[PDB]
Amino acid sequence: SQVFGVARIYASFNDTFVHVTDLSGKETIARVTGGMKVKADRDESSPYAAMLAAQDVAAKCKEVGITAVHVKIRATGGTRTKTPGPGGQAALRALARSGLRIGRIEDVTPVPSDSTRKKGGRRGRRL
Amino acid sequence: AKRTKKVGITGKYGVRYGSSLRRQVKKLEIQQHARYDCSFCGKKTVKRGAAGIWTCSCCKKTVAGGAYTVSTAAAATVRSTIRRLREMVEA
């Protein structure tokens, strides 16, 4: 009796995407990012920004007719991090608290069976 | 006896045109004048006519090939690509 979408939280460092789509993913519903919910250029990835983004996404989802979401959490993946950003957890929590129902949380971080050369040189980023 | 140290077939050019150009020419002249294995009769009798035409002195079969070698690496890769695409199409 629930209308299901997909949450598609892309939690990188430097940003968080809360992207609710249909079950197919072709049609999207209220893609909201923390960069539009804060304006500092450094809090883009903050859990506060992610929570505000997820609140807005859940509001628009409940106005469209989406009542439950299957969750897909991802990091940047590929060759870059594989660790979800600081805002993914807060986005998932805010989606839970905003009245949306939750189903089937899964990690879809793209993981190579092996990859192209990682960025940074063999001596790495030297800071 | 070995008559030249390195010029090989390009000893016909004497001291002219530059050693690098003579070397580059030498590689492709050796390729274009070599005898190749015939894929039809199994003999080492395929020689070039004009560029891109490779004829077997035995079994008289001629195949279109590279300018200076019977089969270019590009053509072999294309043959493999076409084989893969055809196998997908038919199965």
Binding site: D22, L23, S24, K26, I29 | -
Partner: protein, 212 residues
Amino acid sequence: VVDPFTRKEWFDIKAPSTFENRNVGKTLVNKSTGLKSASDALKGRVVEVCLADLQGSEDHSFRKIKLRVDEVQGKNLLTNFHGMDFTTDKLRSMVRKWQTLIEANVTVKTSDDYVLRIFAIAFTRKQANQVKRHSYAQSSHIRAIRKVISEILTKEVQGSTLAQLTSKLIPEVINKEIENATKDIFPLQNIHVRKVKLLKQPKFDVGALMAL
């Protein structure tokens, strides 16, 4: 100011003819118009749904099923099997140190016309009395086990249609067949058919789709 959701209408995804439950959910699309058919924007969509949601049983929490919309029948998107894959958490939980991971994959045509790649996985395990702490296979065991798994997968396809293979995957009978055929080589705790990939579909055959 455009409100794209006012011109969108909903369709109900009817995935199986056989799984347990036809209703997997709803999707939305722009209203059919002069130059952009709604059925055109549909009919290529793939929905990935948990096999637990398809069967009603939580012991299928892994093994998501892909179902692609093949026909639109009066606000009903009838789909068909498009592929199956384990969940990332399940695969990562299965992959542990101090054991051998054995992977096999075959490309085989189903009995009707479908071309599929089957990916099966297995892991060596310790015996019940084992004191040694890793229980590795000897890679000739691995070659033999991979051969056996390849034969089993190739025989289970080519003797079944896509629908019959789908109905065979759900009870995991192929897992048990692999276990019985490999138990005399190495124990192989965690046999699974981890992936089915659809490489080429035959002619659409709406007649064959209309089994639901």
